[PDB]
Design a protein around this nucleic acid. Structure first.
Ligand SMILES: [Mg+2]
Ligand SMILES: [Mg+2]
Ligand SMILES: [Mg+2]
Ligand SMILES: [Mg+2]
Ligand SMILES: [Mg+2]
Ligand SMILES: [Mg+2]
Ligand SMILES: [Mg+2]
Ligand SMILES: [Zn+2]
Ligand SMILES: [Zn+2]
Lengths: 117, 49, 190, 292, 169, 86, 77, 55
RNA sequence: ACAGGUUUGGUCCUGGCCUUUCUAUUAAUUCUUAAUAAAAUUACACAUGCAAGUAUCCGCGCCCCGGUGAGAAUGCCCUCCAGAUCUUAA
């Protein structure tokens, strides 16, 4: 529909199943609904691991870099998937979250060590 | 240095054309200068040229 | 069922040859309904616990007919010999609980080579098999990869200066939090 | 200059030894049936419609490419120790583009340990079937490719269907493809079942494997018992092409024998069951020269 | 159909079997033929048979017939650039007109292949969505992934109710 | 219905009778057997070498019911119902 | 969601946002990592803009487009 | 879009002129627009409260 | 439609009605547990609660999501696009 503003954004459309998510990485308007109209579907992300224990992430890089060079904004999970794939640099939020997880482990090991004695 | 997958994309793109050059691909940073958030932005009307 | 281990021993027995013969088990079965056109959905289940639902199905009225993927002589009666498609439930007359099991056992006998079906001639996947591309072959490793350094210099955690720490501690007064040094390289387990 | 399978000097022999049996190539399958059509044809129009069916049976008898086992993909693009334990499962990323071949797709995997490596051969074709599916291929390995189901399908004499299933499922340069294609060739000659692959598109594969393994004893006597000497002389000729340095290839050069004696030369030089081959040759001679 | 002289020419198969695709320049086709004389028999049979086959595959090209205006049958193509292509037909047969028009202003087999090859690119196999545009709707139906809870119930350790019941205690 | 069924079933034209009245080979082209030209009836007697007139447009008496069934405009709910066996 | 003409809530009338706690030795490295990440993604964006420029200029007036734009008119004449 | 039975809506265009006249005639002056209650940190013109970090 | 019942002492033809198939709401009778999907009388009037915030002030968003089908035979599809928005020097 006609909008007053908005911008092209590569995001994840949560079109899936109950207790079973499945994201469609699409490039849509920022004023459009999540599962609504889009311009062109890029890829697909399966959050749940399959029988082989792999989270299937599918990226159409040839259209992703085209829309990025045309001016498409990116979301935080999209940049996270690109950083995990290696098409984009690793996100500072992923780096700091891994550091925080390491600090939580470093606190829990000392707590479990001081609990036994 | 480029990200790993994007660097391998160029390493496999230029290989198929017969380019034996093993030079390391670099990413330019001249036109990527960004002002900090304390830099005040102009308020005048931008003229389309 | 006395066999209970080999379902095909009943199909070649004399009690099957004098009862059914060269005709399928569903040849003499006629389904009763309300008009000339039967309902598109047959009976859901005709064996509810210990009671039989009146006139039983061809497979269900004879308890020695075991729906299994081993006895192909019983499974071929429910697959067309010419088109190779499985007959629907209103065709033969079995209840849906046995029709679903029949489709499952026919598939389990087809993926085991016990039942014949069409195997088309499929062309190979790719037109040209070239393992010389960089996608499948090894790529020249990075100078930081052959050295062991992170891909970007800002990936590792660098200790910030004390002047910048104090400049932040002056502007963010009142909302301070406890400091944290460099995170450990290896995260220990539980 | 080693003889390859795509060479015309071997394809011209394999096409000739395959043979044209229209009643076997254009055989009614188990698909959906339809009422046939009829049209009045003269003798020349009938011969034209027959030669059109022969030139179509050529494309039906297009040979599948036999290749060597591919090299395992072991390559690491990046190693990020920061992500040693942030995730339990591994992320598989696939480059999808209609304009690029499947041999040039980037199929990477970020392991939970933190390494961004290339996907193995067992994962690359699985994800390629996931995102570019083709009829006849399965995501998981089919149970029918186990050795007991293979033994049952060999006892039901369905080797042509086993081969048409394996070529459809696996890639020609994979490992399981070569494994099953060799395991069926170890059975068709153990039981002397070369008659099944006579007019199929898989005769040249087992011929080119038997000449590479020097297993020609039963394959010769079957072509002799089938009153096919032009196929056996060309089979020995293709053996002489494949093994140039050998007493069997050099004796025929130093003697200048005909196609009928090229079989005896191999039956005396490097034949395992040479007495059986020579007995079949005598029994074919004394049964053909008197009757015809 | 039953009504008419040749009922076969009023079917989708007869309209679809005509392989005459004009170029992007062709705009107007004026056919001028007569209804008498043994010469214009080929033009009359062309107007009777092939005109619907051309108009089916050229819906945007205007086609206008004129009867008993000029003593000689002809065609007149009006292109986008302004060029008028005059075609004379006096003793040509029905098929010769079709092959001559496909020779002068048509689309080659190489031209017609690439358009459908580019149209095929629109439907991508790796995309997901409705059955009208894509091949798969719920990723659950992939043979390797997690089944579709509308068909196979999920285990107890994976449901959000059990998760919020563990988070409560 | 019975009289017309027997009349139409008795007024059939065998393939051999077609090949005799046309002096041409009657060739069956099965779909699942590819382009294989199976010959069902041979025109015994003088086999004419003159091909039949290849009509570019057949003037056949088509039927709207079969044209609808071929073009897929048969949206009736009684046409594709599941019924019992023979 | 609400509308520009919908009045705010009574319990939200006298409520202001409260900032969370800040770790300076983590906030500094996070800001510098943000800047070092955004400069690289900006360079990649400019490179992709250049690729789109090259593809658009090729598909408009390339050494392959001019050949067809000449040979079509040649065969037409 | 373009239909033969479209109606000549004049009130919608009159209200645009009225609102455009009101925007310049009752334009709030910046002195009272940027006013500030230093006790409650609330703007008297708009009615918004200043952030906690600006107190 | 693979059709069937029904006009008449009876037969044939024409011709309408109904039955047999599938789906949705309501009502009656009956009813044990789970998973999934959907919740649909009302453009009649609403008590009460929540649904637009963020931010070192400025500013930016505030029927955007979501809701409904009253009006309009409205419209489907196809050209040209002013204007608005995102990144750039264009
Ligand atoms: Mg839901
Ligand atoms: Mg009457
Ligand atoms: Mg109710
Ligand atoms: Mg505000
Ligand atoms: Mg709506
Ligand atoms: Mg009205
Ligand atoms: Mg515009
Ligand atoms: Zn039953
Ligand atoms: Zn699902």
């Amino acid at each position: 529909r006609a909008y007053r503003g908005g911008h092209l954004t590569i995001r994840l459309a949560l079109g899936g199943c109950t207790n079973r998510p499945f994201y469609r990485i699409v490039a849509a308007h920022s004023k459009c609904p999540r599962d609504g109209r889009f311009v062109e579907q890029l890829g697909s992300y399966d959050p749940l691991p399959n029988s082989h224990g792999e989270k299937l992430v599918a990226l159409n890089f040839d259209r992703i870099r085209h829309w990025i060079g045309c001016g498409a904004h990116l979301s935080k999970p999209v940049e996270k998937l690109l950083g995990l794939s290696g098409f984009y640099p690793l996100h500072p939020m992923m780096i700091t979250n891994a550091e925080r997880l390491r600090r939580k482990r470093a606190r829990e090991v000392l707590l479990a060590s001081q609990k036994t004695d | 240095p480029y990200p790993p997958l994007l660097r391998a994309m160029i390493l496999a793109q230029r290989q198929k054309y017969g380019d034996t050059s093993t030079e390391e691909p670099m990413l330019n940073l001249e036109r990527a200068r960004i002002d900090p958030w304390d830099y005040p932005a102009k308020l005048e009307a931008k003229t389309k040229t | 069922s006395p066999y209970k281990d080999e379902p095909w021993k009943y199909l070649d027995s004399e009690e099957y040859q004098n009862r059914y013969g060269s005709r399928p088990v569903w040849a003499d079965y006629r389904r009763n309904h309300k008009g000339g056109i039967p309902p598109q959905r047959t009976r859901k289940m005709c064996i509810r616990g210990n009671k039989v639902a009146g006139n039983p199905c061809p497979i269900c009225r004879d308890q020695k007919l075991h729906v299994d993927f081993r006895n192909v002589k019983l499974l071929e009666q429910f697959v067309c010999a010419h088109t190779g498609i499985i007959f629907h439930a209103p065709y033969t007359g079995v209840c849906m609980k046995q029709h679903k099991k029949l489709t499952q056992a026919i598939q389990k006998a087809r993926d085991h080579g016990l039942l014949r079906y069409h195997i088309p001639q499929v062309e190979p996947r790719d037109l040209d098999f070239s393992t010389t591309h960089g996608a499948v072959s090894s790529t020249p490793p990075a100078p930081t990869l052959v050295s062991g350094d992170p891909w970007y210099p800002w990936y590792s955690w660098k200790q910030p200066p004390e002047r910048e720490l104090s400049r932040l501690r002056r502007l963010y007064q009142g909302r301070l939090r406890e400091e944290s040094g460099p995170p450990p390289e290896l995260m220990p387990e539980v | 200059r080693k003889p390859t399978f795509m060479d015309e000097e071997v394809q011209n022999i394999l096409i000739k030894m395959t043979g044209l049996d229209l009643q076997k190539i254009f055989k009614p399958a188990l698909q959906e049936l339809k009422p046939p059509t009829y049209k009045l044809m003269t003798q020349a129009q009938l011969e034209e419609a027959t030669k059109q069916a022969v030139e179509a049976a050529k494309v039906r008898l297009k040979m599948p490419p036999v290749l060597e086992e591919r090299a395992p993909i072991n390559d690491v693009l990046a190693e990020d120790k920061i992500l040693e334990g942030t995730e339990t499962a591994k992320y598989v990323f696939t480059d999808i583009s209609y304009s690029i071949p499947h041999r040039e797709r980037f199929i990477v995997v970020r392991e939970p340990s933190g390494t961004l490596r290339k996907a193995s051969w067992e994962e690359r074709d699985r994800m390629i079937q996931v995102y570019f599916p083709r009829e006849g291929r399965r995501i998981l390995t089919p149970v029918i490719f186990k050795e007991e189901n293979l033994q049952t399908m060999y006892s039901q004499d369905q080797h042509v269907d086993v081969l048409n299933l394996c070529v459809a499922q696996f890639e020609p340069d994979s490992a399981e493809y070569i494994k099953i294609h060799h395991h069926t060739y170890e059975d068709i000659d153990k039981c002397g079942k070369y008659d099944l692959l006579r007019s199929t598109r898989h005769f040249g594969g087992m011929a080119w494997y038997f000449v590479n393994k020097k297993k020609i004893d039963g394959l010769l006597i079957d072509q002799i018992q089938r009153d096919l000497v032009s196929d056996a002389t060309s089979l020995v000729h293709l053996y002489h092409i494949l093994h140039p340095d050998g007493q069997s290839a050099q004796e025929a050069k130093k003697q200048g024998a005909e196609g009928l004696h090229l079989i005896k030369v191999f039956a005396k030089t490097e034949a395992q069951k040479g007495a059986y081959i020579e007995l079949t040759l005598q029994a074919y001679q004394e049964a053909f020269i008197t009757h015809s | 159909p039953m009504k008419g002289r040749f009922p076969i020419r009023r079917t989708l198969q007869y309209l679809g079997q005509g392989d005459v695709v004009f170029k992007d320049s062709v705009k107007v086709m004026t056919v001028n033929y007569n209804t008498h004389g043994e010469l214009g028999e080929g033009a009359r049979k062309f107007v009777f048979f092939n005109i619907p086959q051309i108009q089916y595959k050229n819906p945007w090209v205007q086609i206008t017939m004129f009867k008993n205006m000029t003593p000689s049958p002809f065609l007149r193509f009006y292109l986008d650039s302004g060029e008028q292509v005059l075609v004379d037909v006096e003793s040509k047969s029905n098929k010769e007109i079709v092959e001559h028009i496909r020779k002068i202003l048509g689309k080659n087999e190489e031209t017609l292949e690439k358009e459908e090859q580019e149209k095929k690119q629109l439907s991508h196999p790796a995309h997901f969505g409705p059955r009208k545009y894509c091949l798969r709707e719920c990723m659950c139906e992939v043979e390797g992934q997690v089944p579709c809870p509308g068909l196979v119930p999920l285990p107890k350790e994976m449901t959000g109710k059990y998760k919020a019941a563990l988070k409560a205690t | 219905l019975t009289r017309g069924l027997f009349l139409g079933l008795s007024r059939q034209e065998t393939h051999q009778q077609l090949a005799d009245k046309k002096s041409l080979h009657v060739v069956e082209f099965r779909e699942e057997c590819g382009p294989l030209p199976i010959v069902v009836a041979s025109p015994q007697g003088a086999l004419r070498k003159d091909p039949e007139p290849e009509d570019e447009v057949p003037d056949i008496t088509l039927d709207w019911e079969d044209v609808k069934a071929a073009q897929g405009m048969k949206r009736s709910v009684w046409s594709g119902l599941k019924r019992a066996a023979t | 969601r609400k509308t520009r003409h919908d009045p705010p809530a009574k319990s939200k009338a006298g409520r202001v946002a409260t900032p969370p706690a800040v770790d300076p030795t983590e906030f500094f490295v996070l800001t510098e990592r943000y800047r070092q990440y955004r400069q690289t993604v900006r360079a990649l964006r400019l490179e992709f803009m250049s690729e789109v420029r090259k593809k658009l200029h090729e598909a408009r007036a390339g050494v392959q487009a001019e050949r067809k734009a000449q040979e079509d008119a040649a065969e037409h004449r | 879009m373009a239909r033969k039975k479209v109606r000549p809506r004049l009130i919608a265009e009159l209200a645009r002129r009225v609102r455009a006249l009101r925007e310049q005639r009752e334009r709030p002056r910046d002195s009272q627009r940027y006013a500030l209650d230093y006790e409650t940190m609330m703007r008297p013109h708009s009615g918004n409260r200043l952030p906690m970090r600006a107190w």
